[PDB]
């Protein structure tokens, strides 16, 4: 049969047709992932804002405290959703959208603390004019892996310790958080 040769020279040009435009739809989509990613990158680009985060959510959403108010915000793919420690300076592009994560604002009001709570997540702080407030404490004061102290009459320890009822903590009154330990010597 001289019909078998002609039946194939067809399926050959059949496949060569779909093959020439597959090797290309990749080249198009492959560009658009290089364009989309390029856009997500172009968010973190300045000008850019800051401000603390009160809580984590499940659907890639967060409770921040930019510009004096509590706000639930959409955060970026660049982002590690549940490695977001509670109360950590985070960052924002114009229309508020979280990009990087940073540390812990380490400046502002110094209060002393009177006790922890049942919650163990919250504490009674007395500022200056004997004003007593209620903040939460960002993890790094109740991460379990903290030493249990020993007394302070064999001198100056002030090495990462467990939260003692007399220390001085550094707070952002206006948001609701403590941030870290601190030595006082008399």
């Amino acid at each position: 049969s001289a019909r078998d040769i002609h039946q194939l020279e067809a399926r050959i040009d059949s496949l060569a047709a779909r093959n020439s435009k597959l090797m290309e739809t990749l080249k198009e989509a492959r560009q658009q992932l290089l364009a989309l990613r390029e856009e997500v990158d172009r968010l973190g680009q300045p000008p850019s804002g800051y401000g603390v985060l009160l809580a984590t959510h499940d659907d890639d959403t967060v409770d921040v405290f930019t510009s004096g108010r509590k706000m639930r915000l959409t955060c970026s793919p660049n982002i590690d959703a549940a490695s977001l420690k509670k109360g950590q300076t985070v960052r924002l592009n114009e229309a508020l959208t979280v990009v990087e994560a940073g540390t812990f604002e380490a400046v502002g009001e110094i209060s002393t603390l009177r006790e922890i709570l049942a919650d163990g997540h919250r504490a009674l702080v007395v500022g200056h004019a004997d004003e007593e407030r209620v903040v939460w404490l960002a993890d790094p004061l109740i991460a379990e892996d903290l030493p249990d102290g020993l007394p302070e009459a064999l001198n100056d320890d002030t090495r990462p310790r467990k939260l003692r009822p007399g220390d001085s903590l550094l707070v952002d009154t206006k948001a609701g958080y403590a941030f870290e330990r601190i030595p006082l010597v008399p």
Binding site: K21, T25, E28, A29, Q32, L36, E94, A95
Partner: protein
């Protein structure tokens, strides 16, 4: 948010749904 940032996101998912409709038009004529 700006009047220039809002018009760049309607043009990205608009050359998108145009590629998605050519996309499922290449996966069904290749079968």
């Amino acid at each position: 948010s700006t009047a220039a940032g809002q018009e760049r996101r309607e043009k990205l998912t608009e050359e998108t749904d145009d590629l998605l409709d050519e996309i499922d038009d290449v996966l069904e004529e290749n079968a």
